[PDB]
């Protein structure tokens, strides 16, 4: 049989983490990625299942995710190395029948464990499932450079940050009409930041962690990567503009509204009101 | 027979979209590319023609383009993926005998359609054919980073933008002596922005869409990519200069005139007058 | 999504047909391969399913195969080209709910059809399913050189051919204890040769077609390829031995029996009696 | 850290099994290879050591091999697949402190076990260590085609087989002056054939198994592969000669003696006496 | 035998220098890298040892490093070329029994010598061994762009530089809790700058050379590269922020303290006091 | 025979032009490169010499270059494409016996001609030969981004530009102690700019063309590329520092002097006096 | 500089030895190849010359070869490994000014020495130079399978062997009109067999060593390989024909004569007379 490393989901994880590494968004072990799978995706690959799946309890019960398999990045692992040794840096985990924990079916060799931002990932998957009737399947986190830089210079407010990002590239309204939610800075890797993130995920597909990075949700690896890339392109434009002295003209409220109408999208009200 | 994916035109499309992706000009589905072909180019490749070519009406009749085949990028498709799966992201279309619509001869698999900027593309091909006696064959659109940034900070005026870009790199006058036309911001993906672009294309080979990106036209994929790259290199230089406090010296009107004379080119008058 | 061409089953078909081409067993369009799949194998790959699956009736109803998907080689297609263009040379077909025909879900581009030995394949799958309680999943046919040559020189009889092949390599008894069935020469590509082959498949995993080639059955692509390779290695040895004047010593009946006992296998009685 | 698959010994195992596969010596799971290592060779690679090394008792105690690590091919595994998935087909085992068994430190995934010819391998390593003062480190077994064919046609006697192989290529006396030992046919995969092989290994570096294949020993993977290749090239020549009616002239006893003298080698007496 | 160029340590040196080249941190011969090895790492590779190891005296005796082998970059060699010709750009050196000098066992072909920053490297290895009980094995130096830029604009003081870098990316405190030491500018390539660097290395794992670059220490190539990458990512953020007019909000003292507590790290006191 | 495209000089031209393309220094046809060869370099490659070498007169006689072969980039050719089709983008030219013109021995297919900056190249080769006693062999021109940006913001004066570049990276004094000469802006592609450049080349190895790019000279492709890369790295640092408000501390005159003394280099006096 | 391993002559040696390995002509260390070079071929590559060239005396003085460089295969080295590690298996040697010995300028690492058939090689180069006015530059030896087999079955006589090889493929007369000389069997690796071979080389370009192999001479690596390949193809045909009972029809004397006339070649008289 073909090895699981050649599967669509390991190859896709390799693509997204390598692309994110080339972008300069994932120095060291910065970032983490988790993709929800089906039983069908992994069925062909039993030859690669560890004989004695390691069992690890979840920070807190998550019954909506019972029996759900996922492919995740490991704690302390480098995006840069996922293409070099997938099994060492990725893992396939399956949540048990009552949502209390998960088994490591494959990967995470040498006693590696899932990303320390697992709470944030699983709590958000769980909310994005409710918000999109199961259409979303990916949670991606990275240290998007210009988005981080802007958190030191713009008001850390959902409405003002959303409007600025919308202005920084025409497509932004269309790509993220629900805008981007901003949390206050929090200690990372906890249930609290996980919870706050999951909470923001009910209303937005993008969430910013000041002085830290971004979190995105989407139906596929490409759209989630694309979603973050759009927001970061916009941020990149803004960083150049602010470095040139600021906007002397920009996309206006009237134009944002025309844009939402032509693309059949309803823009986040707080950000449009500005 | 060799598969149409190995053809000169699919390979060329792969090169230009991949190069544009590496430049950071085409996040997500940003940008779109269309290349006019001949019957001879696709003659060898009938084995790859779909049995039942899907027929799609053109936004508006375009008789000057009757019976003309093109290779195009798909709507919502990522430049980053063209190299991975050409058929899923590109398509060969042929305009019918009376310019009313086109048939999808190849690609655009899974019910994909041509770029939503098709109007802008076809309308501009149509004008560039008239302006150049058929020499131009490509229309490329991308989210050129520095060019976008400059639309928030320079006067969105054809003459002032052209002069600034000419000053930002000696070769610019030579590469785009007709300068670059700027439109007002418009809702993208419409016949209106298409028309306005095509209109600008009668006088310029480069057209800017504020807060959005650029459009270029040329005889080949390489020259069109080159044309945009030149303009964006200039913009990149300008962004660094404005970030350093502004031009303390620059290419002068006298110099731009000497330059036009040595290269047998007649510089756009409004821009030279400044 | 990853393209179906990167799937385990297309990659496996590529491996087996390329390996068989390198062996010199598949000149021109010689040979054909068919692999039974599950719904799970193809579930991830709907993006690659033709919109209007072509429907083709089965030579004769086969209700035991209802709703079963398979990946097959095309009629007139070259094993050598499967690695170059999988979609042109392979196809994924699914038998309809009542076994009357099948839909072409993917591949077989340019109006190609499944192998003209489809009857032989499907009738044999059907018998091997009954004989092995669904463990067998592959039917492979190739023009194994030395096996063909021996059909002009040895008695075309199941018992004598089985015993000779068993003698030509120690492992043979262990690999094919049920021996190899020989048909009389028949016109290929018919229901009759299909039927005769399927009939032989109830008692053997290997069937020879004099002056033509071999047919093998097994749980996986590798074991079926390996099964044929073993039989052909043996044949290769025999062709050298007969070219040297014949066996001056060989594996005896007593030794074949000891061999069957150590490997817990019960050798075909007719061949052991010789 | 670099993955153990990139190590010198896994790469070497890949090379030798792949080369042997291309030679047509290893159909299916035919052949098996074992290479003795040092602690230093595997020291860098602890990250790849299974957490809970599976323990498997040796057929019989082998104290001379205590604490010795080896890389081996797996039982039922194909030489053809070693390059595709090293861990699935190879394994690193270490003999325990009192030679009673071994631990599987790496590989042999999916519950695979070492080759079923392990007895023959370990017993022979053990004798070749005594015969060469530890210089030999490899034991290779393969289904060398012409060598097999010749066992059906030449007298299965050490002296006559050795002399014929020495005559079949000038270098043979030089490469294997101790000649090649022939056993009677035996049931494979037992302690008995293991013992008999190991016994022959005290006097020869090559041992033939009639109707089966060859076993070779040497200091390195290359020399052992080379040793077998030499013997098989000779056999190939002999097969062509016997197919042409037999030797009409050949290397004479006098010549073989001159040859042994020029290369400072003392030819096996029984074979030279013929 | 496999060539030493395919070893774990040459491959790792290739990866780190190539990655640093792609980052734009090592123009020309900028940067130098040295990795401490064991006897076991190089034992397998004697076939590649020069016959007459060149002997070169150390700037000053270093008995703590006696008999220790290392792989180092050469003086005037380009990181960009390490992947193209490892032996021309790298070397394996072994310090003699009394720390007075070293032998060049491999590489540094065409009379090349170790990096001219060898003092700084060896003195620092020597101090990092004491400070970490031998856990550190790498010293890496590169011209990290943003880190260099910041030395012209921030107070060249350990405490203020450390606090600014900690603020520029949440993970920084966790990755380098001991902070980064800054030296006064010094003439490079001397014992004095080496000494000063080694001295800073007793308290920090990162050391900055104003108007020059950075030096890092760690247990492996990946962590040391990761360590520098983290510091440089933070600097990159700061350069964008200072280019936008400065921090309007940032990570506060209280937050840095909460962060150190959740990750069980004790932050450098001088930098936390600011 | 091996094709000239695999020669050291074509491969080296491919490397330098590809590297410069990845740096973003050579949009479109920006830049040009010329490398002096010997008769020995091209002797093995006569099979690839055009039968009827095209003859082209030199702008002005250059007897010091008589009978000297060179490999050059073509006029209007893209650095990006050199790796894709060397013969279409490069050419081997040999100056005739009296320096009046040259023959195109290889490449420049489809009627291409050497770079339109040929005057500047040949005139500079000619001066660098005199200034270095034939050690220099390369002249490289590129649109180095930050170096261009700085020409709009710093005083276009040899002394002040040299001192600023020296301050922007410690190594700069050591790499280019003769500093960088700046010309006034001139119409490119003429004998006049060629002459002025050649003139500046008597005293410097780096020459800047305001609002245009840089020209470098060196003994090999790697050192010339490295020389420009150093200068451009320094400019990149300066652009970040000026974007942050300017130098608050920098390398002082005293330190530059200590630096020149330790490296046995005599710094350009006008720049040190500032 | 590009490493000598990428040179035309190392690449050509890799090609020929790899091709010969794939042909099955060079088991173990069977065969050896030597190619005459010029000073110009190696001039670019001094960076790769060993500092202390090993000096080795020639078996006997050869003043006609004074100051001549050659690339040779090493003693005991495998053709299979030349592609994997050229320096370990090949060497560049230069004969000293008075033909007494040679220096090893490059390769033959780990104390390897030139092929033990060096006498045969150099003596033959020396004669082929005289016989062809320096046009021949290569001497190749290999264990061509069918040519070896035929030496046990055909009369070992120049005339009869030549005529049989001429009959076995129409082109043979044209490719080797001077026929192939056969020596009596001799102990290999001596001056005597070298001398005898060199002697045969005055009249033929192909020489056979019974029960051993062939030696060929030619102007280039490709023609020498081609020359042997032709002879071996013919032998391969003969071995099949003799295995089928012998020639029932063949190329007649009259036809050989017509053939020599149409190709302006004068066939060896002894072989035509048969
Ligand atoms: Zn993070
Ligand atoms: Zn757009
Ligand atoms: Zn058939
Ligand atoms: Zn066996
Ligand atoms: Zn440095
Ligand atoms: Zn230029
Ligand atoms: Zn030989």
PDB file of N, CA, C and O in Angstrom, chain E residues 121-162:
ATOM      1  N   UNK E 121      33.955  31.523  18.012  1.00  0.00           N
ATOM      2  CA  UNK E 121      33.265  30.242  17.999  1.00  0.00           C
ATOM      3  C   UNK E 121      33.750  29.316  19.106  1.00  0.00           C
ATOM      4  O   UNK E 121      32.963  28.992  20.032  1.00  0.00           O
ATOM      5  N   UNK E 122      35.028  28.959  19.058  1.00  0.00           N
ATOM      6  CA  UNK E 122      35.558  28.039  20.071  1.00  0.00           C
ATOM      7  C   UNK E 122      35.456  28.563  21.481  1.00  0.00           C
ATOM      8  O   UNK E 122      34.934  27.834  22.358  1.00  0.00           O
ATOM      9  N   UNK E 123      35.818  29.851  21.728  1.00  0.00           N
ATOM     10  CA  UNK E 123      35.655  30.399  23.070  1.00  0.00           C
ATOM     11  C   UNK E 123      34.211  30.298  23.536  1.00  0.00           C
ATOM     12  O   UNK E 123      34.010  29.858  24.668  1.00  0.00           O
ATOM     13  N   UNK E 124      33.247  30.627  22.683  1.00  0.00           N
ATOM     14  CA  UNK E 124      31.861  30.509  23.053  1.00  0.00           C
ATOM     15  C   UNK E 124      31.377  29.069  23.248  1.00  0.00           C
ATOM     16  O   UNK E 124      30.514  28.858  24.088  1.00  0.00           O
ATOM     17  N   UNK E 125      31.841  28.112  22.441  1.00  0.00           N
ATOM     18  CA  UNK E 125      31.430  26.740  22.654  1.00  0.00           C
ATOM     19  C   UNK E 125      31.814  26.329  24.062  1.00  0.00           C
ATOM     20  O   UNK E 125      31.071  25.726  24.839  1.00  0.00           O
ATOM     21  N   UNK E 126      33.048  26.712  24.372  1.00  0.00           N
ATOM     22  CA  UNK E 126      33.698  26.459  25.622  1.00  0.00           C
ATOM     23  C   UNK E 126      32.895  27.027  26.760  1.00  0.00           C
ATOM     24  O   UNK E 126      32.537  26.268  27.671  1.00  0.00           O
ATOM     25  N   UNK E 127      32.375  28.253  26.671  1.00  0.00           N
ATOM     26  CA  UNK E 127      31.551  28.803  27.741  1.00  0.00           C
ATOM     27  C   UNK E 127      30.135  28.239  27.787  1.00  0.00           C
ATOM     28  O   UNK E 127      29.528  28.083  28.856  1.00  0.00           O
ATOM     29  N   UNK E 128      29.588  27.959  26.617  1.00  0.00           N
ATOM     30  CA  UNK E 128      28.260  27.401  26.577  1.00  0.00           C
ATOM     31  C   UNK E 128      28.274  25.967  27.137  1.00  0.00           C
ATOM     32  O   UNK E 128      27.264  25.569  27.769  1.00  0.00           O
ATOM     33  N   UNK E 129      29.397  25.258  26.941  1.00  0.00           N
ATOM     34  CA  UNK E 129      29.472  23.950  27.566  1.00  0.00           C
ATOM     35  C   UNK E 129      29.358  24.072  29.087  1.00  0.00           C
ATOM     36  O   UNK E 129      28.552  23.370  29.720  1.00  0.00           O
ATOM     37  N   UNK E 130      30.092  24.987  29.697  1.00  0.00           N
ATOM     38  CA  UNK E 130      30.036  25.211  31.141  1.00  0.00           C
ATOM     39  C   UNK E 130      28.653  25.665  31.576  1.00  0.00           C
ATOM     40  O   UNK E 130      28.126  25.154  32.550  1.00  0.00           O
ATOM     41  N   UNK E 131      28.069  26.593  30.858  1.00  0.00           N
ATOM     42  CA  UNK E 131      26.765  27.122  31.223  1.00  0.00           C
ATOM     43  C   UNK E 131      25.620  26.171  31.047  1.00  0.00           C
ATOM     44  O   UNK E 131      24.596  26.472  31.614  1.00  0.00           O
ATOM     45  N   UNK E 132      25.729  25.143  30.229  1.00  0.00           N
ATOM     46  CA  UNK E 132      24.603  24.264  29.972  1.00  0.00           C
ATOM     47  C   UNK E 132      24.910  22.811  30.252  1.00  0.00           C
ATOM     48  O   UNK E 132      24.073  21.935  29.954  1.00  0.00           O
ATOM     49  N   UNK E 133      26.051  22.490  30.816  1.00  0.00           N
ATOM     50  CA  UNK E 133      26.420  21.126  31.169  1.00  0.00           C
ATOM     51  C   UNK E 133      26.447  20.286  29.891  1.00  0.00           C
ATOM     52  O   UNK E 133      25.911  19.196  29.796  1.00  0.00           O
ATOM     53  N   UNK E 134      27.136  20.846  28.906  1.00  0.00           N
ATOM     54  CA  UNK E 134      27.313  20.261  27.640  1.00  0.00           C
ATOM     55  C   UNK E 134      26.088  20.167  26.769  1.00  0.00           C
ATOM     56  O   UNK E 134      26.250  19.520  25.723  1.00  0.00           O
ATOM     57  N   UNK E 135      24.939  20.738  27.038  1.00  0.00           N
ATOM     58  CA  UNK E 135      23.805  20.568  26.156  1.00  0.00           C
ATOM     59  C   UNK E 135      23.962  21.340  24.862  1.00  0.00           C
ATOM     60  O   UNK E 135      23.473  20.909  23.831  1.00  0.00           O
ATOM     61  N   UNK E 136      24.609  22.493  24.829  1.00  0.00           N
ATOM     62  CA  UNK E 136      24.727  23.282  23.629  1.00  0.00           C
ATOM     63  C   UNK E 136      25.801  22.702  22.742  1.00  0.00           C
ATOM     64  O   UNK E 136      26.821  22.284  23.334  1.00  0.00           O
ATOM     65  N   UNK E 137      25.587  22.732  21.419  1.00  0.00           N
ATOM     66  CA  UNK E 137      26.590  22.155  20.529  1.00  0.00           C
ATOM     67  C   UNK E 137      26.840  23.034  19.316  1.00  0.00           C
ATOM     68  O   UNK E 137      27.616  22.723  18.427  1.00  0.00           O
ATOM     69  N   UNK E 138      26.136  24.113  19.149  1.00  0.00           N
ATOM     70  CA  UNK E 138      26.244  24.917  17.973  1.00  0.00           C
ATOM     71  C   UNK E 138      26.511  26.382  18.298  1.00  0.00           C
ATOM     72  O   UNK E 138      25.879  26.953  19.203  1.00  0.00           O
ATOM     73  N   UNK E 139      27.363  26.999  17.483  1.00  0.00           N
ATOM     74  CA  UNK E 139      27.496  28.447  17.543  1.00  0.00           C
ATOM     75  C   UNK E 139      27.231  28.940  16.122  1.00  0.00           C
ATOM     76  O   UNK E 139      27.933  28.435  15.250  1.00  0.00           O
ATOM     77  N   UNK E 140      26.263  29.805  15.923  1.00  0.00           N
ATOM     78  CA  UNK E 140      25.954  30.345  14.617  1.00  0.00           C
ATOM     79  C   UNK E 140      26.067  31.865  14.557  1.00  0.00           C
ATOM     80  O   UNK E 140      25.554  32.520  15.432  1.00  0.00           O
ATOM     81  N   UNK E 141      26.686  32.437  13.542  1.00  0.00           N
ATOM     82  CA  UNK E 141      26.800  33.849  13.350  1.00  0.00           C
ATOM     83  C   UNK E 141      26.233  34.250  12.000  1.00  0.00           C
ATOM     84  O   UNK E 141      26.590  33.607  11.016  1.00  0.00           O
ATOM     85  N   UNK E 142      25.412  35.265  11.902  1.00  0.00           N
ATOM     86  CA  UNK E 142      24.933  35.719  10.615  1.00  0.00           C
ATOM     87  C   UNK E 142      24.620  37.193  10.649  1.00  0.00           C
ATOM     88  O   UNK E 142      24.623  37.850  11.686  1.00  0.00           O
ATOM     89  N   UNK E 143      24.445  37.800   9.488  1.00  0.00           N
ATOM     90  CA  UNK E 143      24.184  39.243   9.363  1.00  0.00           C
ATOM     91  C   UNK E 143      22.686  39.457   9.287  1.00  0.00           C
ATOM     92  O   UNK E 143      22.204  39.843   8.240  1.00  0.00           O
ATOM     93  N   UNK E 144      21.991  39.152  10.382  1.00  0.00           N
ATOM     94  CA  UNK E 144      20.544  39.259  10.434  1.00  0.00           C
ATOM     95  C   UNK E 144      20.098  40.704  10.179  1.00  0.00           C
ATOM     96  O   UNK E 144      20.294  41.609  11.000  1.00  0.00           O
ATOM     97  N   UNK E 145      19.449  40.974   9.057  1.00  0.00           N
ATOM     98  CA  UNK E 145      19.147  42.274   8.590  1.00  0.00           C
ATOM     99  C   UNK E 145      18.525  43.250   9.564  1.00  0.00           C
ATOM    100  O   UNK E 145      19.095  44.299   9.859  1.00  0.00           O
ATOM    101  N   UNK E 146      17.362  42.943  10.105  1.00  0.00           N
ATOM    102  CA  UNK E 146      16.661  43.842  10.973  1.00  0.00           C
ATOM    103  C   UNK E 146      17.391  44.017  12.276  1.00  0.00           C
ATOM    104  O   UNK E 146      17.491  45.113  12.822  1.00  0.00           O
ATOM    105  N   UNK E 147      17.974  42.967  12.820  1.00  0.00           N
ATOM    106  CA  UNK E 147      18.768  43.074  14.048  1.00  0.00           C
ATOM    107  C   UNK E 147      19.860  44.068  13.773  1.00  0.00           C
ATOM    108  O   UNK E 147      20.045  44.979  14.589  1.00  0.00           O
ATOM    109  N   UNK E 148      20.529  44.037  12.640  1.00  0.00           N
ATOM    110  CA  UNK E 148      21.591  45.005  12.374  1.00  0.00           C
ATOM    111  C   UNK E 148      21.028  46.434  12.327  1.00  0.00           C
ATOM    112  O   UNK E 148      21.462  47.374  12.974  1.00  0.00           O
ATOM    113  N   UNK E 149      19.923  46.633  11.596  1.00  0.00           N
ATOM    114  CA  UNK E 149      19.315  47.908  11.460  1.00  0.00           C
ATOM    115  C   UNK E 149      19.006  48.486  12.832  1.00  0.00           C
ATOM    116  O   UNK E 149      19.241  49.688  13.094  1.00  0.00           O
ATOM    117  N   UNK E 150      18.416  47.699  13.703  1.00  0.00           N
ATOM    118  CA  UNK E 150      18.069  48.178  15.007  1.00  0.00           C
ATOM    119  C   UNK E 150      19.307  48.648  15.775  1.00  0.00           C
ATOM    120  O   UNK E 150      19.197  49.591  16.568  1.00  0.00           O
ATOM    121  N   UNK E 151      20.507  48.098  15.579  1.00  0.00           N
ATOM    122  CA  UNK E 151      21.671  48.592  16.313  1.00  0.00           C
ATOM    123  C   UNK E 151      22.022  50.013  15.949  1.00  0.00           C
ATOM    124  O   UNK E 151      22.850  50.602  16.607  1.00  0.00           O
ATOM    125  N   UNK E 152      21.454  50.656  14.946  1.00  0.00           N
ATOM    126  CA  UNK E 152      21.759  52.039  14.651  1.00  0.00           C
ATOM    127  C   UNK E 152      20.749  52.996  15.245  1.00  0.00           C
ATOM    128  O   UNK E 152      20.867  54.170  15.108  1.00  0.00           O
ATOM    129  N   UNK E 153      19.731  52.477  15.927  1.00  0.00           N
ATOM    130  CA  UNK E 153      18.552  53.229  16.284  1.00  0.00           C
ATOM    131  C   UNK E 153      18.106  53.010  17.699  1.00  0.00           C
ATOM    132  O   UNK E 153      17.437  53.889  18.251  1.00  0.00           O
ATOM    133  N   UNK E 154      18.431  51.859  18.295  1.00  0.00           N
ATOM    134  CA  UNK E 154      18.075  51.590  19.682  1.00  0.00           C
ATOM    135  C   UNK E 154      19.334  51.756  20.531  1.00  0.00           C
ATOM    136  O   UNK E 154      20.433  51.740  20.023  1.00  0.00           O
ATOM    137  N   UNK E 155      19.126  51.940  21.840  1.00  0.00           N
ATOM    138  CA  UNK E 155      20.266  52.082  22.740  1.00  0.00           C
ATOM    139  C   UNK E 155      21.013  50.758  22.754  1.00  0.00           C
ATOM    140  O   UNK E 155      20.413  49.737  23.019  1.00  0.00           O
ATOM    141  N   UNK E 156      22.298  50.735  22.427  1.00  0.00           N
ATOM    142  CA  UNK E 156      23.041  49.484  22.439  1.00  0.00           C
ATOM    143  C   UNK E 156      23.323  49.021  23.870  1.00  0.00           C
ATOM    144  O   UNK E 156      24.445  48.999  24.342  1.00  0.00           O
ATOM    145  N   UNK E 157      22.294  48.592  24.569  1.00  0.00           N
ATOM    146  CA  UNK E 157      22.355  48.194  25.941  1.00  0.00           C
ATOM    147  C   UNK E 157      21.638  46.846  26.112  1.00  0.00           C
ATOM    148  O   UNK E 157      20.469  46.700  25.743  1.00  0.00           O
ATOM    149  N   UNK E 158      22.247  45.887  26.775  1.00  0.00           N
ATOM    150  CA  UNK E 158      21.605  44.605  26.965  1.00  0.00           C
ATOM    151  C   UNK E 158      20.177  44.714  27.445  1.00  0.00           C
ATOM    152  O   UNK E 158      19.252  44.091  26.911  1.00  0.00           O
ATOM    153  N   UNK E 159      19.889  45.483  28.466  1.00  0.00           N
ATOM    154  CA  UNK E 159      18.547  45.535  29.014  1.00  0.00           C
ATOM    155  C   UNK E 159      17.565  46.145  28.046  1.00  0.00           C
ATOM    156  O   UNK E 159      16.474  45.562  27.956  1.00  0.00           O
ATOM    157  N   UNK E 160      17.922  47.256  27.406  1.00  0.00           N
ATOM    158  CA  UNK E 160      16.841  47.865  26.602  1.00  0.00           C
ATOM    159  C   UNK E 160      16.622  47.076  25.348  1.00  0.00           C
ATOM    160  O   UNK E 160      15.480  46.856  24.989  1.00  0.00           O
ATOM    161  N   UNK E 161      17.690  46.536  24.756  1.00  0.00           N
ATOM    162  CA  UNK E 161      17.551  45.730  23.560  1.00  0.00           C
ATOM    163  C   UNK E 161      16.758  44.472  23.873  1.00  0.00           C
ATOM    164  O   UNK E 161      15.826  44.138  23.133  1.00  0.00           O
ATOM    165  N   UNK E 162      17.087  43.791  24.948  1.00  0.00           N
ATOM    166  CA  UNK E 162      16.320  42.604  25.312  1.00  0.00           C
ATOM    167  C   UNK E 162      14.855  42.911  25.478  1.00  0.00           C
ATOM    168  O   UNK E 162      14.007  42.203  24.983  1.00  0.00           O
TER     169      UNK E 162
END
